[model samples]
Structure formats: C-alpha cells, structure tokens
Target: KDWTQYVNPLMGSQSTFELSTGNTYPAIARPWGMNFWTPQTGKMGDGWQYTYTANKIRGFKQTHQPSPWINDYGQFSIMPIVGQPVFDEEKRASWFAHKGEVATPYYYKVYLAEHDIVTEMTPTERAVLFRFTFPENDHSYVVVDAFDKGSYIKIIPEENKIIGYTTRNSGGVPENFKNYFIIEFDKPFTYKATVENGNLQENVAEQTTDHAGAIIGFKTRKGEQVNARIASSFISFEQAAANMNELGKDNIEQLAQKGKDAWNQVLGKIEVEGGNLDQYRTFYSCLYRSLLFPRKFYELDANGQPIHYSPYNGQVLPGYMFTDTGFWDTFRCLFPLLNLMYPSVNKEMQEGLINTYLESGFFPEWASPGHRGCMVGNNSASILVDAYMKGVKVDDIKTLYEGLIHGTENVHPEVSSTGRLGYEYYNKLGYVPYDVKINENAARTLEYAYDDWCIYRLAKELKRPKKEISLFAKRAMNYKNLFDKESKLMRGRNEDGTFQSPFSPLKWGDAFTEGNSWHYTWSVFHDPQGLIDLMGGKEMFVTMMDSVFAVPPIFDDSYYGQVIHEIREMTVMNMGNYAHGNQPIQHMIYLYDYAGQPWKAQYWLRQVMDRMYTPGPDGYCGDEDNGQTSAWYVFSALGFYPVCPGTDEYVMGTPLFKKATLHFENGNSLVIDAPNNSTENFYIDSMSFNGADHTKNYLRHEDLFKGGTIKVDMSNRPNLNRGTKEEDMPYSFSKE
Candidate 1:
C-alpha cells in the first residue's frame, strides 16, 4: 500500500539549534558526536552548537560526514545578516535564528528571514543545483573565502567547478578526501575563483582576499541559482567539464524534482505497513541512512577507469580506497543485508578492502583510505571471512587471504590482531584466562571466542577438513572457563582459577567489551545448542532467555568511558530487557528460530525494524558504523536474518513488506512474497522456498544463492506449530 500519509522527514528537524534539519541524509553521511549538523567547521562543536545569521549561501563542502570522529570536512561557512544591513561584519554581531527552514532528502530550502532571502539546494551525481531569491536591495555582494586552507583546490573559471583535495594537513598525509564544486548563476554562470593562504577563499585583487572558499555579489536580483556538487576523484578537467551542463540547468524546478525522485527510489526498497506515520517516516529516513556510506570510491579517470594514487606518498597510487568501514559492528548485519539487497555495491566494498589491504599491508582498525587505525580489534578479518565465504568472490582468494593473514598476524596487541590471536589460543587453552596479562582480558576472551568460531567456520568452508575440525572442536570449548557452572552464567574467571573480586550477571558494566555479564551471557550464538546445554537444557535455556527479556535495564558509571557509546542499550527492548543501541544482542531475534517458536521471532522482528529504522538524520537508533544495524533490518524485513552468517542457516522474521524483489548480477531476482501482510499480522503462517514446503523456521544461505522465489503466508495470529514439525525445525549444529 502506498501510504503517503506516513511520509514526514521532519521528525528530528528541530530537536536543537545544535541539530540540523538540513537537506542531507544521516545514514549517507558521517556523524560528529555532538555538533554534527554539517562538516565544514574546522573544529568540533564550533558549528553544531551554534548558528550564524549570514547569507549568500556559498558552496557545500565535501567533508560533510553526518557525524564526527576525526578530520572534519563539509563544514560549510556562512555569514548572514538581518534588518537593513548590507555587508556589515562588525555591527552584524553574528546573529542566530532558526526562523524558516525546510529540509528534504535531495533538497534544502530555507528562508533566511534575517537576510530577507531564501536558499535552496539539489544535487546530481557530480553537480549540485542551488537557487537563491532575494528581496530588492542595495550594496549586497557575495564574497569567496579561500583562506579555509588545504591544497589541491583549483578554481578554474573556465571549468566552473571548485576541485581540490580535502585532507589532514599534518604528518604530510592525504586523507582519502575529494575535491568539490559550488557554482552560482544570475547570467551564463561562468567566473573565476582566486586561491591564496593555503585556502581558496583568499585573493589579492578581490575585496574578499586570499580565501580557500568563496562569497559573491548580486545587485537587486529576485532570481536564484546557487549550487554545489562534489566528486572525490577525477582523471582530468574534462571530467569536471562534463558535469557543468547538469549544474547549469535552466529549469530549476525539474532539478529539484529529480533530487526528490532519487531519494524516493532509495526509500522505496522495503515498504512497511503499520506504526505511527512518523515511525514509517523514521523507517524510510533510517533506510536512507543505510545507504550513506562505506562511501563509493569513484576515483575514475576520464575513461571511467580506476585511478591509482597513494594516500601517503601521492605517487601513482596503484588502485583506490573506500574508507570509514566499521567492520566489527557491520559484519553482523549490514554486510549480509547488502549481500542480498545491493550485491554490486557489496562486491565493490570487498574490492575496496582488498585494494586497501595491498596498499597498507594490513587490514585497518577503522581504516579510512589511509590507516589511521581507529577503534579496536581486527574485525576486518571477520568482514573478509564473511564476504569470501558467503558467495562473494574477491579478485584472488589466496592473495586476499595472504593479506588477511598478514593483518591478523602482524598487528600490535592492545588494538589490532592480538585479540584475534588470543582467540586462536582459546582453542588450546579452553579460554584466555583473565590473569593472562593481555590487556582488556575479559573483553578479549569473549571477542576472541566469536572470532575463532568465525575463522573455524571459514576454514571448514574452504574444505580444510582436518584443520577445520581440529579448530572447530577446540573453538567450541573456548567458552568453558567463563562458564560459572555454579552460577550457571557466562561469568569471568581470573587466570589463577579465581573469580573477579565482585561480579553480578545482572549488573551492567564493561566486564566484557561494551557489555556486562547479563548482556553477553547469551553470546555463544555460533553454537546455540551448546550454549543451551550449558544452561541445563531446552527448558532451562528458554527460561534463561525469557529472564533476559524480562530483566530490568541496568547501568553503572564505572563502565562509562570503556566504550563510551552507551552502546549496550541499542538492541534489546524490554523495559530493560533489550537495548536497541548496542551490538551484542543483534542476533537475539533469531533465537526463536532455534526454540521452535519461529512465529514469536516473526512478530518481534517487525516490532524492531518498524520501531528503529528511519530515512533521516536520527534514522539509526545508534551508531550505524558500516551499516550492520541497517543490514539487520533489511534482511529481517525480507523475512530472514542470518543469526550466524558463518553457519549456513537463516532464522525467520516477520517481514513488513508484502514482497521484496532482489535483483542480482546473475540476471535473476530473488522475490520474497509475503501475501496479506499487515501491521497487525506480524507473524508468518507458513513459508515455501522454490515451490517446496520449507517448513523450517530458517533456510540455508546456499538456498538463496542458487536463486528462486520464496513465498510466505503472513498473519497476525501465531502459527505456533505450523512450520515446526519433528524434522522441520531449524538445523542444529549439535545434533546427532
């Protein structure tokens, strides 16, 4: 059903002057922790928490990551004045007002009431369309500020595009930044920009001197045409020249429509029914966010071939790089979702990883185009492992693996592959005991266990039967020591066979990375049955899960800075039972597929997706880091989510859309038809994959890869035993 009534992208538009309802998608941009409106501010908190009452909107900057972490860009600078003021900087007093603004997926229109002008923007693949309408005036001029600093910025009047490099100016390194354009028009729209003082905004001849960015002058004009578009890389001036006509379109209205259409196509991927109109708005907004990054490496030359450039030496960089991938958080959900929904893009990400590894000689920890190495753990290995095994082909598996091995084996201990290696030790030592002297011991133990399990699965899939079996056998035993058989919970143990001074499964703390004992107690998902057995049996396991869902939310100040995201509260939703903001409980929805209660899983999956995702700035309930969280929703709404990708099976979930058609490179579409699906009917009545009575609550990854249609009956009432007959249950790795 086409529910236009639910289409409102302005939910978080005015939460604060610090927050922006500007015309940009959050999931599409990087987020600055606090002042995340737009990226142009040279320093953090400079722009987000404040407002500038200046106008003559210049050009959009290229470094506009939706949020901030490191190296800021897209920090567009503006100076606006209100009430009978013409080019007065001192008396203007930097007035601030949230007077009139409208933000859409592809366009931004704001009535700068102070300046008595309206500003609007729309974007094309390589160009932007800007329209500004001003009241009749005198002594009004626009100036360019080229002093914002950084190199490779060229303002060629003939080309009509501001192209340059946006990078970290220190340590002589070029951060994988893109050059951009912001063009203005009243006439044929052609002019020159002066560059000076390490920035392009300055010029000796012009009134606004020697600036890296710009400003302009227009006399008594009632018309508008101010636009900016950015391209990360270009082979020649011709490529930049090719994009000018689109930017200089005569019909401004049509350009705006095109932007809206582009946004709609992205928002329409997985349709939803039921929930507040705002929730659906949020869903679409979140879906918009899911598309934001793992930004495309468009370093194509005039021939559209890949460009080679080094982030360090700037020598003929042999290949390309797409940075800002949060592998640890993403592999669990985002990568899998893209594997099914956007495979071409998925393959590009893999290729990007392979190319980056060759250039840097190791997988990065939050590796951007260059290896600044942010965050922790070599989860990039997990991403590679997941991608390679799950039907995605890299250029050369062995070459990629060699790089993978290098990163996993050579990195330092506190951060890189040390934990991955410890995971290997877990097989021999049963668990990396706390007294082992490795830093962050408890967090390492659990993380290593998961990593080892993933690696073991990868080895097996490659047909290394002996190595796989040995590793798998040992891997399964890694969680043993952490198992406090006395308390029947996965608690930490000191190296000398003593428990930590004080511990409580219910208390929330960083006993494990970003989670407490209670949050991680159920983490043995790679081997759920074994986990079940550890807690007694099916009945006991089920009881434990119920308790987990029923437990009150817990918090402690001590664990605050360890993983300062308030990350634990991301997934689970029971009064305190589930935190939708964290990553650990990402697989919890699939537990029902294992418990013979697939219908319950079906219901909750919808509840989670509809409640969480959005297409706007706040679309992600928490940090999206590489799209894992969005991937979870995308897959679940398609009727299945891989609880453990290393495993062949996929657990069931109630799909919100009546049908989702996936177009694959093989020229076939994997259509999921959930007939009669509605808001109330968030449970699966039955399902069939490839015209077979697929009575299990889950399906294998291989089944979809082979390609076919999967039809499902959806209803509100629980199909409690409908698909769970004796032999029809989800596969159990522990089965005899």
Candidate 2:
C-alpha cells in the first residue's frame, strides 16, 4: 500500500491564538530533513505562518520552525508575479482555493489564481526544486527573497544564479550567524533588479540591506514549465552550491518519487488493518507528524563526513547534530516510540545528542537549532535512559553520565529549561519550596525526582560506584515531599515545610507548569504504587482517579491573569479535570493499571482516541508540541503505551484496530490481534501471548522484540475478574 496516500499534511492548521486544536503547519520536507517549506499566510515574522482560515498566499517560505509559538528562523520565501516584478509580498499576494491545493509530506502543489500559474515543489535533504507552469506572458517573473534581519543579495543575470545569506533568527546564536543560500534556474534571466527594503532598483546586481533580494523577469509560453533549484547552508555559499550539486541531475518527478519512498519506509513499519478509513488516515497523519521535528542539522562534506556549524560558537565544526525539538514534551512518548520501532535512527540521534554536550557544554531542552528557554524540566534524562534501557546501543556512556551528573549541579546561563532549577534546595531539602524564588517549584521538584531516578537506573546498569549512585536513588523519592495528605493531592510548600496556605487545586501555573495539583499529583511516574499507598489504598485511589473526570471544570485564572488556551481546551474536552491537551497529565488515564483495573483504562483510552483525534484541518485537542500528542495517539491505537520510559514494560490498553503488525528493527515482528475491537467493544475479555494466558496488565520489552502473537478477546461489558490481583500490575518504584 502507498502509506503516504493516507497522510494529510493539513491536519492541524485550523488554529488561532485564542484557541488551538493542533497549532501545526503543513511542513513539506523529508523526515528529519535540514529544512521544510510551507505556504505563508500569517505574513512575515508572524508565528502563525499557515493558518487554515487564511485565503491569500503571501509567499512560499523555507522554514525551520518547530511550533507556531516558538516561531520561525533561518527563513526566506519565493514568489512568482505576472505583469510586474513586484518585490513586496503583500502587493504580489494571490488568492487561492483549498480545493486546488495538495499537501503531502514530500511534495506540495497549489494554484496561484491571480497569476494563473501552478506552483509545484519537491525537496531533497538540503535542497528544493520548484516547477512553475505559467500561461502566456511576456513579463513572467520569479522573486528569490533572503529575509529581513540583515541580508545580502548578489544577482548574476547572465549566469541565471542568485547567492545570498539571511541573519534572521529567534535568538540563541552568535552575532555572526547567517544562512547562506544559492538559487539556480534552468532558464536564463532577461531582466534582473535588486530590491532594497521593499523598493526595487533597476540596473543593480548586488546590494546589502535589511530586506535584501533580487527579482528576475523571463518570458514563457502558454504551457511552458520553468524549473528552479534552491539550496541553503549554515556554513557558506560554497556549501550551499555543494548542497545543490548533491541533487545530481535529478528532475522534480524523480526527487518527488524518492521523497515518497523515504516517507513510506518510516510510515510502513507498523501496518494496521480492519479499522475505519478515518482511523487509518489519522494514524498515518500522526505518524507522519511525529517524524518531522528534531531536524537534521549536520551536512556531508566533500569526503562525505558529517559536519555542522556550531550554534554555540561561530565556527564550522565536524560532527552530527539535530535541533528544533523540546525534550519536556517529546520525552514521554516520541522518544519511546523511536526506541521501539526506529532504534537505529534513535541511536544516531543519541550520538548527536552526546556531540551536542561536547560542543555546547549542556544538553538542550528546547533546541531551535540551539537552546531556548521554553519549557521546564531536566527531562533529557528520560530520553537518554529510555533508549538505553530499550537496547538502543548508545556509545560513550561515560560522557552521557557526565552530562547527567553536571546537570544536577549547574543551570544553563540563558537557557533555563535544560538544567535543574532550584536544584540546591532539591538536593538539600529534597524538594523545591513553592514560596521560594524559583518558578514552577512543585513541577521542578516532581520532575527532578523522576529525572534522578533515571540517572540512578543508568548508574546501576553501568555498575558505577555504590556511594555516588546511592544519593540519586534516595533523591528519586523526593516527589513525596509535595504530597498533602489532607487534600489528597500534591500541594505547594513554603521554605519552612508548611503547605502553602489558601491552596486551590483549580489554580494553574503558579507552582506547576501549565497545570494544577490535580495534574501534578500523578507526576510520580516511576512509582505509582507508592502514590496509591500515600492516598490510603486501592479503593481511595480508584475513587480519586474517578473524581478527576467527575469534578467541575472550574479554574482560577489568577495565576496566569487570564484564561490560557490550555485552560479553554480542558474546559471544552468534557473530560472534567483531566487535561489531556498537555503533556503533564496524558499518562494519567492509563494509571488505572496500577490499581488492578485494566478495564477502566481500556474504556477511557478508547474514549480519548475516538473523541479527541480526527483527520481534518482541526484534528487535535491541543498543541501537538513537537510530536508528543501525535505519538500518544500512535502508541494508544496500537494497544499499549510507554507510561514510564525507564521501565521495560508497556502498560496495556484496549486496541483500536483489529490487527497490527509491528516490524522490529532487530529483524522480528510483534502482531496484535483483536477480532472484536469495534467501537462498542472497548473492554478486554481475555488475552493470550503466544498461546499462554496473559493475565498481566503489561508486556515485557524483550517479548516484543522476538516474534510472537498477542490475541485479545474484546467485549462490550467490563471483565472485572481479569487483572484483579495486585501481582498483575506494571512496574512501581515501591513494588508493593
């Protein structure tokens, strides 16, 4: 099957600043390529670059943007005009219909109605080839734009080439940073002029200004197609030309076919059958989204060795690198999915992450080509530990250990999201006090505890010294310090060990990160059993879990001063206090397994998959957040989820598809069979793995890598007898 056919690139563009479904753009680039291209509708320097509500197209831009909130950098655009060579994008804007546009992972085609031209494009790793079909026109023109934050343009009309560089960025770079680009056309240029700050000047070949570019005019017949190849490099213009030469005489069709093949290889690894057409489309669309971020930042040299321009320093260094992914969001499911199906790719990413430490002196949490202060967490520990625990074969374990150890002692100077914040208090007092100067202190204490657990696990695996690793082991339980036995939820505490007075569980973001204690209470991912005991027992635990969805959606917006989009999203989801839109509480639905109630997890998991996800322009419940939301859907639909990454087990949930075959990277397969997995039959009646009765609420990691078949019996009624014993539970830190 052509799996790419099921992917709709426009699944999440129907979003606004006040409210969001997916807050995503149709990124037309290869999986983890150096760059992506998109239709610009939100104007220059606007974060919402390709909103579905927009009707006019300003330009087609080359983007390295991860999310709309983080915004774009290393950006430029290309546009075609009919009568005059207009340099202003707004003046040359064309009206377009959605029906005339086709967006895919590898290619994009759209009709510019005002100009009566068809624009099609395809991409290689670092280069793009544009095919423009024009009507009869003597004044046909195409403009090459190197965008506004200090730029240079040099046009050679006789050679039909333009070379330039753009210094536009959203911070986190040296002052000398520039993205050098080169454009070559198959047709010769009849007229060329340099555009300086929206003003076109005739008889000019080169210029340096803020808004710098050159527009070239040519003649075309009624059905003639003109081809233009553009490539960019962070190193130099010579490297950009080398990137263009890497295309090697390939046409648009050939490059498009190769791009399709590349996507097929990643999307076809998991084959699902006997599901609705919408499910199939949503599955593939989400799978395609998950592979788009953390783009490749390294390029091959003349000798074909990986080299990159170090964002930390102003030098071209020899190493592999990646950027534009936030670890606080992706560490939960995206990295686990990689360790499960695409171990080899994750292996390479792991090596690159180590190289990032060697170059930048710290691992990045939010890296848009470099570090940015976006989210809160030292959650890079989860990403590294998950891969190592799942056998991703990471090299340089000592270096990884050094980075993790250094993280406990130091905080990034400018990028506050990477290192441990309030770590001095966390190490000395075992928790970051809420009344302290540190923001998001409760969130920091909880996340730091789990991160310490990951480090301890890694230390034990590598056989480190007992005394050094023992401190981390004790620190792993620091999450309990925030527990308020009276409220039965996590509460913020003052420096003197008193729960902060006038506490309200509905309040958001004063002590937590984008959530309240109702969400952060379950932040102890490594030890849910300990949480159950702290809450008094299985009965109260189940009651409290049910109350999360039964409570009113009332919230205190005083923390943020106004209702944020995340608050609105949760209030509308009708799931009560459960805010699945964000990453902090996504795994809360599956925590029923620890209470020996797998059927509850099945019912809620199915409800979430069916209600929150779809295959349309507005197809998500919240910010996709660099593939974390999509990865959650992909894992749940296939019958399990990575609830805790440091563990080797996949906590069980009901399957959405009748059958799924997971092709392992180690040359084996795991098949999931659920014959009665219809919408109403959301409970598991029975289950067997390889002909043995599987009563456990989890699957071992090693069993998945070997060839086996998981046969599950589904029913509309709940099966209370199955998984009733505590022994059937998944991993818990205190393994009660």
Candidate 3:
C-alpha cells in the first residue's frame, strides 16, 4: 500500500501557541532506531529546535531528545558551508524553500539557498550517512558542532576523520557523561581549522577546547557530491568507529533504502481501507512518531551480542539497554500498543528496563543517558505488568519484582522512583499529605496506588507469597483516602488527616502534574468503578462525566504562580474542563463504557479524533510525549483504547475507517470491520466478534491473540441499548 508515502515527518514541526501541534521534529530514522537526524532551524537552547515556520537552515542535528520539556542528550550537529564561515548558527544559516525540501521517515533533503548546497541525511541503527553537493568553491566545508558546554574535537588529518566527545549535564546524566562520535569523510580536506569561543583558528593540525568543534574545507566543482558517514557511542570513540562498518559496505542510496524498508515492515502491520487522503496521512504520520522513541542505546559485538555502557554507574555493562523514555507518559498507551503489534520489540524493551532496574536499584522514571528523576510515578511497573498479562516473556522476574517492590516501599534521597516521594507517608497516612510531603501530593498518591495495583497483579501471576500480594492489593486502594465526597474530586490532604482548604478545581499544579483537580479527578484508571461509587451511582456518575465536558474552561495562577502551557492548552480546547492536551485525562472519555453509557464514549471519541487531530503542520492537540498522544489516536482509530494498562482489555469505541486489519506477530490477524463507518455515522449500533453476537463493551487481549473478525455496525443515531446491560461492562479492579 506504499505506507511510507502516507507518512509526512513534517506534520508537527510547526507546533506552537493554541494549536499545540505535537512538539516533535521531522526525524529521519527507522522504527525504534538508535539515532534520529532532524534539521536544526532554531537556535540551540530554544525549545523550538526545528520549527517549520523558521526560514533558515542551521544544521542537521543527531539528537536523542525525547521531548522539548526534557531536552536532548548525546547531541551534535553538522552544517555545510561555502566561502566565508560564520560560526553563529543564525548568521551562518541559509534560507531554504519549503517546496524544495523533502522529509520522510528514512530520508531528508533540503537545498541551502545562500551556500548553493544540497544537504541530505539517512540513518541506520547506530550510524548516519550525510550527502552534500557543493557548488564550485575553493573553501567549501562541513562544520561539526558538539551541542554542549564542555566538548572536545580532534581532527585526525591522516585519516580525513574527526573524532571527539560532547558532555551534557541535564536530566540526571552523570557529571562525566559524554557521547563519543567519529565522522569519516569520503574526500580528504584541503584545509583544516578549529572553532572555539566563536572564533575560527584556520590552518590547525588539531585542537581540543571546551565547547570546541572543527571545520574541514574542501575544493569542489559545481556538481561535486561528498558523502560522510558518522557513528556515535556512549561507551567509547572506538566503538563508534566500529559501528560505521555497515556504511563502508552500503552506499548512501542503499542505506536510505534499507531504512525505508525497515520502516515499511513496522508501518505496514496495520492497513486501513475507506479513509480519505488526510486520514491516511495523519494515521501514518502518527504511526511514524510512535516508533521513534526510547531509542537504542546498546551496541552489538563481533558476535552480535548486545552491550551498553551503564549511565547510572558510569561503567560498561554486558547486556541489552535503552534510554530516553519516561513511563509516566508511555505506560498509558505506547507500551500496550507495542505489546499488541510488536511483541518482540516490547519484550526487548522490558528486558532493557529490567537491566535499568538492576543498575539503578529502581525503575527509571525519566532516563536520558541515565536517570533524570523527572516526572511522577514508577509507571514502568504498569508496563511490565501489562506485558506479563499479555504473555510477553521477560527473564529475571524475581529480580524485577524486588525492584518494583523497592520502588513502592522505600524512599530514595537522590533517585526518582514510584514510591520515592512519600512512600512511608502514604503507607502510614493512607495519602501523601500536602502539608507534610508537599508538591503534587494527591497526584502522587493516586499514581502510587495504581503502581501498587500493578505490583499486586505481578505478584499474583508469579505465585509469590500470599502476604506480598495481599499487602500490595490493600495498598492499591490508597486513592480512596484522598477523594473528597462533597466535591466529587480528588483533593489534597493535610498531615493531620484533614482535607486541604481553599481547593479550586481550575488551579494548575499545586498537587498535580501539569493539570488541575478536574483533570486528575478521573485518574483512577485501575478502579473506575470505585471512582463512580465515590460520585454516588451510575446516574450521578454519568452526570459528573457530562459535567467534565460541560464546565467552562477557566484557570488561575495559584499553583504555578503563572499560567502554565498545560493550563492554556486545556482552556483553549472546546471540551470544557476535560484536558485532552495532558495524559491524566486520556482515558476519561472511554470511562463511559464502564458507566453504562457506551454511546457517549463513541460520540466523544469520534469528536476527539475528528477535531483534535488532522493532517498538516498543526496536527496534534498537545505534545506527543514520546508516543502516548499518537498511540491514543492509533488505538482509538482502530475501534478501542487501552484505558487501563495493568489489564489486557481494550474498551471499544468508534472506528474512524471502514476496515482495519491488524497483523499480529503470531501470524494471526484481527480484521476490524466497521461497516458504514464515517464521520456522519460515528455511533456503534451493534457489534459481533468472529461473526458471533458480541454485546460486550470491551475485548480481552486473549480474544485478540486468537485473531478473527470484529464486525461493528455503525449508525448516525446513538444506540443506547447496545451496551447498557451489567454483563457487557468493562473490567475494573474495584468491582472485582
């Protein structure tokens, strides 16, 4: 189906303001490939590193940045220059036309108008191939800049190579952390120079200085093309050189073709029919984004054995490893999607996570090169539990379980773990008190409870001691401790076991992460029925659910002292106080299925899919956050969502396309046939699984594994009777 053609890597490059298009770059790499190359259009420290609105081309950066909020690690960039050299990115940048630029998952090409040069980039798992065509000039050059404060570059003139390392100190990477790289050029340099402190020192054999870089000049004709192969490693510069062995065998075109074929294998897993051009493009573009994260940090040996340098201990380790991921964002959708579509990839990622736990003594909350201790919750347990429930095999289960329990029971003074913030307080007081613990107290308690639930599930599956399972299962109900019955919201509590006074629903970030009380109120994804019971009954729960999308969007600066971007994004949306821009409320709309209002879920899911996403520069409603935001669209478009990660059930919703065939790893297939599906007919009138009458509002993971036909009947009008019965409701831990 030429799925690669439907992927536009530039869809979210221009995201900003109220549009909140994904905070993503036009990355060119294979699915879950080691490194990504994106055109650096903006200045180095600006969050908008590669905005489409920018008019100049600075350089192509080799980045491992997960999100702008959590910037890059192991970063460097390459710029081609002619005539006089300007070290400043802004002054040296050349104007480029959008029409002349082409971007895809595998390749990116742009003509530098001022320098009269064409630049292109392609990537393999651990190496990148850069092709540059230069106009007739005596001083044609390619500049290599390490995007860090303490960096060093050495020009190996004999080999026409540059080998160096760059050190960045953001997001919990070690003090001596450095990313080593070796770039080899096809043509030798005629002149060599070094740049330090914004001044160029010409005619240098080699140079080493802080924030240092090198520029190698070349003599070229009008149509002369030079290819450079670059490789990076966290272990050492020698490994970086060894990683470039593939580049020696394959030409630039062949490497690019390999990348395209790799992406086709992953993107071709799901095929849709009866959708418009925009839908196809949006769907595939999002699918492209979903695969570019938690990049490969391990390198292969001569025997093809995986080995990686441990950023946590600052030592080389013998095993698989990966970095640049936060479970708080990805555990909700991305890992679950991987479990369903790419089980092998998901299994490897879980093993890497276990390795991370073995090295750090806790599961990483946010890891760039190492643990950044960013965000909230030890959500990796949820991912592991989800994988285990779906029969994804992971070794060292007992060691992994110990780490999970440590995260839930102990407090780390330096490291970030699920229970690090206030584990003792939560165990004693039943909730993290705002007066004592401080900072996202309620949010932490709720998320910790969920993480505990995941531990309980894992312990039960492993046949661990009954005491361990019982303790974790009891701790999983901690969310009920902070719920305010009068307000029907999860509010902060004091050390004295009293509710925090002066609570406002629209205040951002006092006891929440980038959201307010209303947005976090429905965060009990593992126990939605408990939440419904807290808000009275089924009828009242439906009323409160409607109120979530009915209240006017108003926010104050009480918590953050100024309006945060999340607050602005939530208020900007038309969905009342329901903040789809953030992750906490991602599963809120789907909760209708459990509340005996499946039609309401269909209506809202279709609205979110049709309005919040599109095919253009401003395509997303919020930061994609690795892949969680896009994964939401991918699953919902396929007629369901993984509302709860610890379990295997997918809450059914409206399908955007007439048909979607999900090709699984076991050689089985689940054909989702939504007959008469369209924007006009967004309501599901009836459904059948394997040609049998299926009135259930959800489908289990086991049912999907033994793949068959899932036929859904759609109508313009709502079908209130289809899923209102007691037996048709989705699973919930509280109800169980």
- RMSD to truth, every model: 5.6, 1.1, 1.5
Show model 2 residue runs off by greater than 4 Å: none
lDDT tens per residue, model 3, 663-693? 9999999899986997799999999999799
lDDT of 1 by residue, 1-736 (tens): 3322234334332222222233222221221111112212123223232213233232223333433443344333333322432322233222224346555545556665445666565555545555556566543433333224453344444444344433332121354433333333443322233444433333322322223433334345544334333323322344445555544554447766665566555455455543455455554554555665566534445565655454433444544455545665666776666665566666777886777666656665554434553434556656777777767778777777667556534654433532254444444566655556544455556555665566666666666659545755465557656877777777767666787667776545445655667667766656676777788876676677667657766655474544244433332335355665557777876776676667766766777776665554444455454455655666666677777665666777777777676655555657788767877878778788888887877777767767678888878789767755546656445562
**What is the Cα-based lDDT of residue 706 in candidate 2?**
88
Residue 82 lDDT in candidate 2: 91
Model 3 residue 497 distance off true place after TM-score fit, in angstroms = 1.6
Instruction: Kindly indicate the candidate among 1 and 2 with the higher lDDT.
Output: 2
Our model 1 lands, by Cα RMSD against the true structure, at 5.6
By TM-score, the candidates rank as 2, 3, 1
In order, what lDDT does every prediction score?
A: 0.53, 0.89, 0.84
Which candidate tops TM-score?
Answer: 2
The superposed Cα distance between candidate 3 and the true structure at residue 596, in angstroms, equals 0.9
Once fitted onto the true fold, the runs of candidate 1 whose alpha carbons sit more than 4 angstroms away are 1-60, 64-66, 69-102, 125-127, 141-213, 224-282, 308-316, 372-375, 412-440, 463-469, 507-509, 561-574, 610-620, 705-709, 723-736
**Deviation (Å) of 437 in candidate 2:** 1.7
